[model samples]
Target: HHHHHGGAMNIQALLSEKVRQAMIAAGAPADCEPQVRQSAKVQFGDYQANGMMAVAKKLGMAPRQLAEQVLTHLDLNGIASKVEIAGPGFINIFLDPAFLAEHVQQALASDRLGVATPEKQTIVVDYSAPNVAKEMHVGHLRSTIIGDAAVRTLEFLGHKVIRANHVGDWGTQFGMLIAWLEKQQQENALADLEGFYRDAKKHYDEDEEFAERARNYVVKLQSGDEYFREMWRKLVDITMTQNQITYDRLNVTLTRDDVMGESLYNPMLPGIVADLKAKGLAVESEGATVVFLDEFKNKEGEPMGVIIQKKDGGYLYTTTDIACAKYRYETLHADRVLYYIDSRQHQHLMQAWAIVRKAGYVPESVPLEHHMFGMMLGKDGKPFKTRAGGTVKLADLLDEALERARRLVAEKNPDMPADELEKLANAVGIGAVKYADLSKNRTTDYIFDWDNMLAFEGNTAPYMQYAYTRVLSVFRKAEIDEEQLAAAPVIIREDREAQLAARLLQFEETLTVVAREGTPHVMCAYLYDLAGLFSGFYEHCPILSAENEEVRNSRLKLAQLTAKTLKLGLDTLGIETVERM
Candidate 1:
């Protein structure tokens, strides 16, 4: 549980706790804890604590009078703005301009940019699990994107992160695919062996005879046919090559070194079933070996049952997931297990976690989380699909986005070099997609609009990228070196400059909430707001036009720090930032 830096503590929480203690010392109700919340007005302050009203209600006093009393006991000289009782006794704490500038300078010097690392723990994140031999689709996109962000955030916070793809490489469907491939080979189908996936899917859907043959073929493969096993391995290899492209585009580093697919747990499933039976945790009910939960009731008031084994000796998803969880805890000695999946599987995940807990595979202190994300829909408000009414390939969709980005760069900066445009396109295009997914609540289904995502306005990746580019443009125009700006003394004078500085200092606070809530969107929203504040500061305060040497140096430092923070935050969310476009 060693943290590289001090254990992660949100500054807002620190301030709120101090205020609560002061209120208690002043003879306020014992239960009166200051509730800390983010301020909607980023231009005015870093945080707005509305605890005075609640404390006043408990103490039977007017809110403004109560706020004044609380301020008398609370010494918030350096940490907060002027403590003024605003409308209806709301304590409006304005940040000091000098303190704000010091925060920005400190963040630039720190490796984590003022964000503290948390207590280290081993975390296994299961995500991006597409079925073997099946094309990767938009549904898989959600898991991949969200899981990647989770890995980045946890690892940055000093957690030992394990990225489990949980790919569907071992299943009954592989049997038919192998059998079909063997049949095609007899007729010299090896010429186009790479195209077998499309043909296999088509035949499985159209020909009932083929489907029946596939079922029987699956049984043989499961029974350990040598030829079928070899074919299945080759098929998996072919599919993995395609999946690698999607991972590469997003700069994800998953490899065979850390890969443990569904097939990996197949061997352990039987042992899990036997262990359950031995503990009287399972019973035969209607030809299935099921585990019933007395605490979990369905909508009809019936106890929910988790079926581990079917009548035909086949295993269910619950059984495999349970085996996986046990393996991670007992074998891998994981301190935490995180499932990055869609919200639709909420109940399934809860059931699996319950079974794991019941089986006592993990300690009570260990954390088990279901990081559920919502569906990705098209503009038409339905599941994303191709115009051909089939699953849209993830690679194709990403490629198209990059192509559009290329065109946008061409239109904006025609004289830019080809190589520069290509780099910018890749960063901006992929970043827009990642930001679009991360900018919304993880549990809310988001509409995938191409135009909106790529637009350089209003809380999008392009908007943040543009802000970074503007900062860079300022430096380039003035011929200022990045190293020199990094060492400059930061100062805040203009109202917008002070506001931006305060927001920059809250990087640690924002990250703490994101990690606690298991939501990347919260961090994304904070970055977007930070970018907006920087934009306003840039428009109003000219860095190079300052008359005094200290003022000019400070403005330049602020600009540099803003760009660095934007890039760092975007990187945490797995979004890329561009220097241009």
Candidate 2:
């Protein structure tokens, strides 16, 4: 299969391929690579090919001399307005405005904004692993939304995406929780999950008799006691039922079917431990099964021992993760597995993946990606929490988002109906929280500020949401059907129109990058830049009132494409766009 997986009219890839052809014709190797990149500044050109310098060094020739030869054989006649050799033999390509205009028209006619579906792969994304019998907190926010955005982008590219909510459903803690539930005599009697958990822990620590029963329950539950299993199922159901509401409010794509908890891999652990021991990859150390990895070291500069099974005959998280990775590949046929865990677990995942590699449980062909993100800190530079220093609940955070958004919207438009007001508020509110996290780089910690997120200025969600509405308002006011604009060819006469068209044609390239790198912030930055470019075009160019009827219609087509690009771009990030704000 061809490696150049892109839209039919992917300008960047097209330019790169063209440059490579020119390089090969100019006496370069058959497998030459053209390092083509979008120019940083407009003064340089639209795109730059910087492969000449490296090629010249390989061929033992002067860089500028080779650039002259490549330019003679370069064929960008109608594609570029000008192709010049810049400093140090860099080939600069200024795309023809007419070419951009024609492509813009073609893109506007398509639903996917000219994005082509690439070859599909079955990818498993693990994220949002909230424990059973506990409410989701602010800590789960990043993994949930970021993973969903990646899942959306991959699916949009025609890949099969399996969401793996690696929920914490197993462990000795369940024993305590189940014993407490039986004592209460009713499940519904424990309404608050947080309080129920605290009470369970208190009882387990203070009451020795209750603790003994809890310990016994753990053994019975592991042995597949029907009563314990039923109680465990009830606890998981109640917690997830409440969590489903939070997922709905956040517009996340997780469902009950995605819950691949630790328990699912529990039965595979003992066999895996025994196999590792038999294979000599693991050894008995201090009455425990351990894998000593040289890749990781302890404080004494010795190989760190990763405990797979404890002295008490219980498996650790590393063992489960190894089994999880093995299951995803061997059974689920996963082409790739992405873990949207936080940075704190980097060492843990690496250790487990190392053991998996050594055991050959997963082959080297499949990729196991750890797309780890940082924390969400308050303005005080600490992890986001309530005033009392407790972790903030996800539901509470969303409710506050809604209330704040409602107040902001109502103050701006008091005469708006209650129903419409509520819908808009939900969009802006939930969208603000998600976008604030997504707009920032995922590898670094970000501050959660309501005032900044709700503001209609800068790169906030409200701003992007409002920008979508503003573009839509133009069509509403002009009262033009989309079919009417479909016939009008885009004309890029003014500098603003040319720039807007250039940016609009870059939609597919942006989506491709976001999909490949697993970063939604890149998409956010592109849409934010596109919105600003549209604002510039809107300010200077008169869409309804132009020099002639043809020009006016042509300008309207640009606006139409811009609107579609913004909406599609936001959709890939799992953000909702409204017709009006």
Candidate 3:
């Protein structure tokens, strides 16, 4: 998967054009669209174009009549070996075996492995976004894992991707946290940080004197009071440093440079409010400045509003995000800006997008979307929380996952070396957590089940990871170099071989969908089905055990391509593959 890049054939587009031309030649409507889909059953053919029925209706003709007429006009020789008319004028296309063999060979010959390159564009992805002075919880895993997958996939497609962490580093909570840390001795200022936050929150909530001091610190920090600001910086550093450790352990691509926090927008907030007032878009309401969008209406028919500034001279999230939108667009000039956030922020993002566009901060040509996803739930079908109903800290969850992985790895292979086992455990543990969340559709509320996620079977990271190792073990066992294996011509005569080869060729298509939709589940599902196909091929079609040398080498070539494809695919999702398990 190295030394080469995407610039590969598009079988679907090629076949779709052919079908379209055939339909036009057959006197069907000139504007008829020929839709092509991969066939569900093997006997049906490789692909199906079912546009005949709808096209026939528009042309005032029978579907079967149009299908046959188009068939006579269809010229598929090298592209497809067989074509048939099925129920409701379904055109089934079976690709030429020799043509299919050539595609697999092309992939084996290139380092790019036959994936198509994309038309380049600049894409800004905002993800992860954990807050300061608070432990990142299991909920943060969704955007972290999902967003990284999108970034990697887009980068692989050669697009310029700007990652935005959008952390919460400035807020009232931070003022309380800094105040608490300042009270402690220098040696223990930020020690047992979680414990300190809990205690500080209690006092800030109950004690009027402490609350007053915390509020004053917030003003001082905002106004650039040097002493308070320095304390603010220290507390933020301590919290973000702790978060950085988790990010590294999770193998996330984000670094400190990507963290553009709410604090970053502080200087711009006043200007933003002033500009809103100048534009006559914001009005004074209940002594607060707000923007009321017509689209943000309640069921009772009154429009809900976005508050730019609260009555107490405090700015809201609406203000922070408005400035964020302007910077991401006016400063970054992104072609498309995607915000990967939970569904809870749906209202805020939509209103922001509308207002940002209205204010000319985001141009009409540039697209902005909130990639809102469902929440992580518990076995009780509620928000995932500890037994005491406290949120599960992300660090602790990852630690527990690693411990479980170490035990599982030990159980699977007790004879493995300690160093190797430790490495495998980390990969498996972190990979499993990421895949478990990514494998579910982003919009579905998935129950967090440890037993299922940790299982070595069924669409888990370990499943794909283990499947990858099995492929590599073949080369190791045969003592054959991959270069030699790739040199051998791939043969696709067996049904199992054909199945695996076809799926491998569809990798680029799968990635294209993921890039457009920010859907990692599509990839997770594809790899799982692909792994199943390889398993069948391994069981029914012998590789190294082939009787003839040519056949043996050809099967080995197939195995090599499969392994490479799996590795490339999983790598896009930010999961690392090991040579051995």
Candidate 4:
């Protein structure tokens, strides 16, 4: 079932395979790794295999002598033009121009930009878990967009991705929310979700009668009273219905069907706690159930006691998470489960997963990954907040983006039509927000700067969207159909053309890194570099006014590939690109 037999996606993978086989043939161990890396400079050629030193040591042979043997065994007939041993026996590989030209032509003609589709895997991604009664805020931004990008990349690679919203629909707070919903019998009462939640909290705290009823409702809801259940459902429906508008505005792929909320695992918690206690993983102490783990130490250097059930017989988030992991593997059939929670919840997830492992709910083979991210900070180096120091609502954030984008676009194109102008503003505004977050490393806190994100230079979304339009402008000016350039073979006479071709072919490698590492910033960085390379190529090489028809067609084909690559790359990041900016 190894589909990696032929039609390798990118040049890096193909080179790695060739060098690996050559290493095996040269008396290296069967598992000897050929550390093939892209060369940093032109003098080192296209790629350098630097595993010679390690392999030579393992084989008890001199590094230079081993490099000679590997070169002899290497059978890169059509792939490379030259192969030479460099300092300390580094194998530098120079790709043949004709080989690159032929591959470029093939990549242009085919869809997916020569990326190979691997065997399909069912991956469940948990992200954007907003509470039912509260509106999503800036805190949910990074997890939602970054996780969506990972989902898109995995799907592009032919994996069946299950988008697990993991909504926080279960809690004692829901009791008050349900009570408030019943008291106000207005269908559209949740027009202002934040205000409605604030009112509910205020009512529950100030009105003793309301607090008594709310407390009773929690017991009723937990005990499955039909009225309480229906009321709770109403609150969840109203909240998610409003959140759907935000998701659509953000261009996220989540739907109501993906709402695997905390309540879904509520019924299983009691059984899980009982099972853990019976299996000796959990113990009852002072009328509460807790699992003491030596893997984690408390402030006193004792094994930390992680409570699964409170003394009053209430389950904890740790217990629910443990059951959630078991459900993902046993029921959802998840080959891998990825949680895009923030870094602060790392210990919580690790504790839950540890218990899940000890209880053998999910096996060691199936991975439960926590793809944690950092916080979003303001330009003042503090947590992102509103001017009033309140949590910035997601709806308000997008609305402001549209307003700023509208003003910016109007200044650029005063004569544009109203409909086109609105559509362009939406794409640019929302794309700028998503791309700004995605372009940064998710493990570190990044400043949320409006000016930097909206700028038309650097690695921002506006620049990428504009770059796509610039590529399309060439086709518009020449009045040449992209279909016509398919038959023309790509020629790499200039160093710029070769460099662009080489970079273009590396798309699959970038995507592979993002897919494996769950890092969309890597994809963003790659696309930015690609746009820069295309800019350099477009300026020096004349596509429309080339000396010969053959060269002109070749360069035009290159431009066509660049446009498609940019559009596809941005699409994977869920950042919309405009035809013009």
Candidate 3 per-residue C-alpha lDDT over 45-69 given as tens digits, one digit per residue, 9 for 90 to 100? 8889989989999888999988999
- Looking at model 4, the pairs that clash are none
Give a tens-digit lDDT track for model 4, residues 263-366. 99988988999899889999977688889887998778889888899899888889999999999998999998999999999999998889999999999998
Question: How far does residue 139 in candidate 3 sit from its true spot (Å)?
Answer: 2.7
lDDT (Cα, 0-100) at 427 in candidate 1:
85
Q: What is the per-residue lDDT of model 1 for residues 371-454, given as tens digits with 9 covering 90 to 100?
A: 888788877888887775787878788889999888776667756777877888898889888888888887888889988988
**Model 2 segments more than 4 A misplaced:** 1-9, 185-208
lDDT of 2 by residue, 468-537 (tens): 8888776654466556667777778888888889888888888888888899999999999999999998
Candidate 2's error at 117, in angstroms? 1.0
The C-alpha TM-scores of every prediction are 0.90, 0.95, 0.93, 0.96
lDDT of 3: 0.85
lDDT of 4 at 115: 82
Report the lDDT of model 3 for residue 135.
79
As for TM-score, the candidate ahead, 2 or 3, is 2
> Which consecutive 10 residues in model 3 have the weakest lDDT in total?
1-10
Query: What clash pairs does model 2 have?
Result: none
Better of 1 and 2 by TM-score: 2
Query: How far out, in Å, is residue 487 in model 1?
Result: 4.8
- Candidate 1 vs candidate 4: the lDDT winner is 4
The local lDDT score (0 to 100) that residue 395 gets in candidate 1 is: 75
Which clashing pairs does model 3 show? Answer: none
